[PDB]
Amino acid sequence: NYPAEPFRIKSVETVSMIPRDERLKKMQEAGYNTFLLNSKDIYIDLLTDSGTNAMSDKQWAGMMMGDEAYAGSENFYHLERTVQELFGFKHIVPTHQGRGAENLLSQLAIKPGQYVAGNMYFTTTRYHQEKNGAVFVDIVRDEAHDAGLNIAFKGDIDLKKLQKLIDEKGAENIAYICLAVTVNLAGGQPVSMANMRAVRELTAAHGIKVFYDATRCVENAYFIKEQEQGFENKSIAEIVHEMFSYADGCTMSGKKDCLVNIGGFLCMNDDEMFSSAKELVVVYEGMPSYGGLAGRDMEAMAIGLREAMQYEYIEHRVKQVRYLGDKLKAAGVPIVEPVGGHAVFLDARRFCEHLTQDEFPAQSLAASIYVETGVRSMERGIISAGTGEHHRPKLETVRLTIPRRVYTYAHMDVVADGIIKLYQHKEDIRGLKFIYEPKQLRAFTARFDYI
Amino acid sequence: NYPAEPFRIKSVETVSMIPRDERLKKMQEAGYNTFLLNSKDIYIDLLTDSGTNAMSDKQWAGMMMGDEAYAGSENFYHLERTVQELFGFKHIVPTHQGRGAENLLSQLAIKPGQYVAGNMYFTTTRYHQEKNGAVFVDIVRDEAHDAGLNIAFKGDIDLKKLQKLIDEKGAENIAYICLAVTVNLAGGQPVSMANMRAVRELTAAHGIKVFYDATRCVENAYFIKEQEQGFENKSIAEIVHEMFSYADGCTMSGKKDCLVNIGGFLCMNDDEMFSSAKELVVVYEGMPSYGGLAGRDMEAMAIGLREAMQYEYIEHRVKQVRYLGDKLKAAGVPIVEPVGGHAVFLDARRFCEHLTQDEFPAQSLAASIYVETGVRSMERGIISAGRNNVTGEHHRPKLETVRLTIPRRVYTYAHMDVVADGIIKLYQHKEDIRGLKFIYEPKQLRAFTARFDYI
Amino acid sequence: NYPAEPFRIKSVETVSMIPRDERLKKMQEAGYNTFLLNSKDIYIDLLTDSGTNAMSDKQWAGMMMGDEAYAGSENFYHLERTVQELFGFKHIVPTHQGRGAENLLSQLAIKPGQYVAGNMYFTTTRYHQEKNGAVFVDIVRDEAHDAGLNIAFKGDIDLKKLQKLIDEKGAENIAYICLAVTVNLAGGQPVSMANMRAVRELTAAHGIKVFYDATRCVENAYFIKEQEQGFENKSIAEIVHEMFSYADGCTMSGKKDCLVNIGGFLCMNDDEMFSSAKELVVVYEGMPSYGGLAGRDMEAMAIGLREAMQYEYIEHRVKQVRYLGDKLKAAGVPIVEPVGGHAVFLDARRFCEHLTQDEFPAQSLAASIYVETGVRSMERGIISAGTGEHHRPKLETVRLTIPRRVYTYAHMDVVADGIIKLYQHKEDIRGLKFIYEPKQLRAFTARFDYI
Amino acid sequence: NYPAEPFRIKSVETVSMIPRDERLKKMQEAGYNTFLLNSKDIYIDLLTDSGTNAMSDKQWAGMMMGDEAYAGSENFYHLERTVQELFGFKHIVPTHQGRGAENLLSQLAIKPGQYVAGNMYFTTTRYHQEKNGAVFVDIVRDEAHDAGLNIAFKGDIDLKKLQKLIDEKGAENIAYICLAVTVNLAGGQPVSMANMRAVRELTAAHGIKVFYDATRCVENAYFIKEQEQGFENKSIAEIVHEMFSYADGCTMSGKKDCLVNIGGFLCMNDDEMFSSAKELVVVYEGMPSYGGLAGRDMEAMAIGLREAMQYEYIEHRVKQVRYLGDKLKAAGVPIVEPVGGHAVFLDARRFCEHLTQDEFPAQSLAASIYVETGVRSMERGIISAGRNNVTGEHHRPKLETVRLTIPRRVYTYAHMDVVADGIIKLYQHKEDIRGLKFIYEPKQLRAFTARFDYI
């Protein structure tokens, strides 16, 4: 059902609990953009699950044993040994976070004319691919773009779409396949092991490389153990190890499923690409022996990755998010289904049907959510999407992203009860109008006002 | 109505979570005594709320700023300034925990042969009083001894009983009145402000001193704000300050409402007694500048005491315990009422009516609770009562209970549901619970080391 | 010679560096009593080596793994296993510090008429002995009371004095022998292994118990390895284990050679006395599973005791103190000889020969030391000693007590150079006059003024 | 004259301290390359002063108060307020370390084909400049290239060389002047305030921007207070603020003079460039609210930067390095002069005159230094210079040196004596030092992974 936290609270973080009238003032000062809210003014911060996790006592013990040597740090040897043991890859290069590893991989495996195809995309990953002269091709199955379609493993790659790309464009013009686990843009949807095995079968026949975006791979591994038949007797670690056996490398953001506040790494099996990675990491991140991370942070990441393999931890992590989604779904609140491993996405298109998409319903829904409850959420609709056009995506959603081991079921009830009350008078949600807008990346800095 | 935690989780503590068949092995290795269980084998440890609290990020920041000087530590000045500000007492002496401060007070304010009267007693406090030649007299009102009587402020002192003591026994023969907030032995029951004022009024008329046992004074202050009329507009800090304005001093166990894992102190307003307190703390605890505590621990206690004054914290603290008690009461599980500020007491006599008290139902109920849920609780019945010194029979108490003591800021409502659901399932087939028989029994304090086996 | 610190600095403590004119004001506000100085106003705090030590990264890692359970804490099992391994005793009871263990032992092994004899005494130890109705008898050899006599192992017990006590008073009237390692009052002087072996031989023949005051036992073990023939091939741990094989138990203040800021314990081999110790620790310290200590503090003490067995640590610890004494002795400054393991004692009797003992030379020397350098020292002459008399001891000294791993050789040079300059114009040191004096323990609270 | 540490040791780091015969084994396993040594096998690690510093108790207290929010973290506001207060710049963007900020600045202020001129260069800074289509021009005064010339402020820019560049190359074709304080490649040599003012005067007349490489700016500020007339009455903070008043921005590696183990930031006054900086930091470092750093690390850097402004700290920092250099110079050991703010450079060409540069004397000297003392140092000569891209021969530099880089607040004078005494003993029989020959050599960056064997 909904198991209790498989841990005790070792230490707590003090938070401000300003009343509604105070929160309304803070939201007005922030231009009705949740990205501009001060952390000190937020009760429950569901903006992202990236780097906001709570570490364990064992991780903080490693923090006291930081070997800050520039080369040969014991923390690096611990992290290297851990990733090689759990992921199975031959070579590891630490980076300060995920997009640092993406910067490395995109410069190492992309020729300025090749194609990169994957199960949807992420902002930072696609930028570095296109920065290095690649053209992105989405080969996820079409069901992944249907927010309400409740089917299992929506992140699976359409093998027919991949076969079409290899035929129409040729394998020589395909840089690599970028398989993401889980698929963040589809709502945190998992990829099945049979899909990873089938993708590896087709790519290996044409000499195409496969690189994983593994930031939420542990959450993906739980869905395999829970819903894919034949993996019920397999541990999380066994599933994680089998997942990466169908890849030539991976980029990892430790800030997610490694249960840390900073850190990432790049993995690969090819010796020659590892040599070029060590030469390139020096100018962007640092030495291959620390890669832009303090020694204590490599230690915390090595310990956190091993803690993520505990079944009871990852079961509670996913089922806490599912509890929030189930409570909203039972009250009639429209959400993306099925609930992903790391967040619940409110479908602002259905939530705010009385508002047009030019009126920023997701942004206005996120602003109202904070004022009524003190809960911060991230707009993931047209504004995040960015001639002189608006650019309209199918998904006008508000993301309630759950940090790991930070909040309780009672905190989820505060989020649910407030959204449910807000939904009961959803007609009151007003539209927004732009005040100041940069280019490139406007979701972070734009300001709005009620219409 | 059961608020969410007024804080986030900064860091977590790893637990093993062994399955039921493994927990049965651990319980058998522990002789069916929860006191002999290893901490590493316990999912939810409700043995005590003493020193088991979770500290805040600000407290751990103070832990990094420990001034470990033997004298004149800045951490002591911060603790001294904090207690003088919040409690109002003139002089402070730190101790390593509560019973260290009780050892000092009992030697400073008791002449051999005098009487000490209080709203019931505690084990360590009464020992140091009687060790120094005092005779304890219970002056709590009779309603406190009714486990099922659900009334407010059961810890209040019966003013007539105190008046009777002053009349039958000379006031010169009364060492002091020991007012405890809350009253742990009655189930964590609070004392009203009107009672503390009346006690201060009566004792001041006869020159009698009043010293508070304030280990859970903050929980007591919340009950005043919630249930005593006239205090709804007053903050927790204002209530705490008014409480101690009716006392000449106090002994504090910081391990409770100061939100720390170690620490205590002794307070008083009398200059002459403070001089003797500084001379006596040297031989038992340490210098008056640290009193058996590391500097970082005085800092954490100074910060934690100020954090306890937050209304939202203490409201959630009390209502989390109340949530556990209400869920048990709604399922028909017999508990001591009303629910105290820090624990829920299962009535093991009614829970295990098919067992006699010679069969240790509370001890057997605690063992089954761990096996079914991984929750450790404390037996508070015949085993804890011990044996009589001369006749060598069982000290048979009216209360055969199992104490579910909640550490502060450590567990969630979901953890309380684990405790409730397991006890409720165990209660639905309570007839299966077997009795226990001694297989090893020490000479004194038997709850800690005794071993048992099923009958 | 004088080896470098066998460790690196992991973290530093910020200290105030007020000028001389500021320090003079602070000293006047403190009534010229170094005990009343604020820690924030002191550059180098040499008041005591008790609880002022710097812990290691491994100890602070254990601090993050505090098992704060009331019973069955893993930290207790670590501490118990460590002491049983290194000391060899069968039973251990943790206490909040040394005088807590002394309170326990004195109530368990003293009948209100028996004698307690030891190599000199300490204030807290002798109080609890006399509190429980014992009469103290000093059986240290007479050479220990000669501050200038530079001989080895001045802390040895005079076997003839012990034989005289057993004959004149009988073994039935002797509670136990209290052997202290090292002897703090004699200047931190060590006890030889042959002495501990000979004492055990004589006491066992008469059924007398031997209990060690082992607060500085590791420093004692180094002197055995350095100066007693036959122990040069033996490690510190082997020497420590052999030392306690000649004792029935011990009281330990972890605040000394366990490299912690709080903590102690009581050891013994007798099962029946251990049962009574567990009953008595409950009313004074706490449960036998934590004994008035947080779980993290038991962990830090278990780790610190194992770190103390490293030869390079304890060699540098002793030789840093010796460096201070050698630099003062080479300049003509009168000190207690030989230099002990934990402190250097300035002989204020020779330092201030132009002042009488009624003028508190040690107290006035300590006050002047702070004003000129910002160094705090402890007066250990007549004032510490306390009819209506003054009570005159042979030793009018000023103790420069060195915390472990806290200061460097450069800090010792600041102490030495300032004392040497002060000694060159020692005639300027003025006498003191009492302003306010309590009874029982007057060194802590008394105030003075210049004459 | 060599002051004592202006602080106490709060906590220590455990070291192994293996004997000489064991260290020889470790050095052979590392192919006689100090870069391949394990940190656990090193007594004194003088490889770099970057990110190896010891933090204070106040910094570790801030580490416990990490606000790990993705946006609007209080730690960012503290860092932003601190840099704006101490440096005077209008806008701040955090980065994970210095070369992250250099990556941003090079893409923001360089159009392809422009010139970048500075007082010598650094490896990472020059790479990002040339990666973005710039041509580097050295405008340091000629005295900086004389290793033995003991003069003050060798890092000053030759104003005539800058005037010549503006004349021969149009000012529109000059991206910016990159003024580094201190100059690491010249041995950590400082830049005078009069030079920074003259550079600002000349560049402002032609509309040219000036950006500082300020990683060791605090050490530079001490040299101004110590050796430049007119600044003896000014505090370190006042000097730092005046230095940056002659710049339009800066790139900072907090891993140096901010007393942290990770962190950096990018500063500027131009509003338009700051808008582009926030857009570019997202794809490389992270949000402008954390920029690739944990919240606790921004807090530690904010606290450490304020601690670096203490005169007594930075005086001891510089004079501890000077103590090592003076002890070597007094024994006849050849070093680069004057001693820089952060390291001492051994002249391995003179130290090992019996060896040719093809025999890697600096690499062989570093290996012997570790075997005799357990001290790791960095080879800074022919091996670090690498090979030419086309012809494939050795890049032969004038400086064949061994760098003894001192982390801040990590070691004592006794540790410096260990370094000096071992090098002095090694110098007394320097003829025994053998040459090295390649047994494994990578394709690029060979100092890190290459292996050697004795000839």
Ligand SMILES: CC1=C(O)/C(=C\N=C(/Cc2ccccc2)C(=O)O)C(COP(=O)(O)O)=CN1
């Ligand atoms: C699937 C996947 C991710 O979700 C991911 C980061 N997610 C993020 C962080 C983010 C990044 C950009 C704008 C807003 C928020 C999330 O808020 O969801 C990265 C980058 O890793 P990094 O942030 O550690 O560099 C790679 N792949």
Ligand SMILES: CC1=C(O)/C(=C\N=C(/Cc2ccccc2)C(=O)O)C(COP(=O)(O)O)=CN1
């Ligand atoms: C040999 C020996 C000791 O030296 C010792 C403490 N020394 C102390 C501490 C102290 C105690 C009383 C007055 C002043 C200073 C020292 O400053 O030198 C204790 C008590 O242990 P505790 O302080 O941990 O209770 C037992 N034996």
Ligand SMILES: Cc1ncc(COP(=O)(O)O)c(/C=N/[C@@H](Cc2ccccc2)C(=O)O)c1O
């Ligand atoms: C009202 C009151 N006053 C003083 C003290 C002593 O303070 P301290 O010395 O413990 O800090 C306590 C201790 N309460 C704990 C711990 C305990 C104590 C004895 C036996 C078992 C467990 C419990 O109630 O379980 C107390 O409740």
Ligand SMILES: Cc1ncc(COP(=O)(O)O)c(/C=N/[C@@H](Cc2ccccc2)C(=O)O)c1O
């Ligand atoms: C003046 C100056 N400006 C910028 C940076 C980059 O900053 P960051 O990215 O390192 O934080 C540095 C790095 N200095 C270190 C570390 C190092 C760097 C390259 C090779 C080996 C070692 C050293 O000098 O040894 C620097 O000195």
Ligand SMILES: [K+]
């Ligand atoms: K973070």
Ligand SMILES: [K+]
């Ligand atoms: K505790």
Ligand SMILES: [K+]
């Ligand atoms: K201390």
Ligand SMILES: [K+]
């Ligand atoms: K580092």
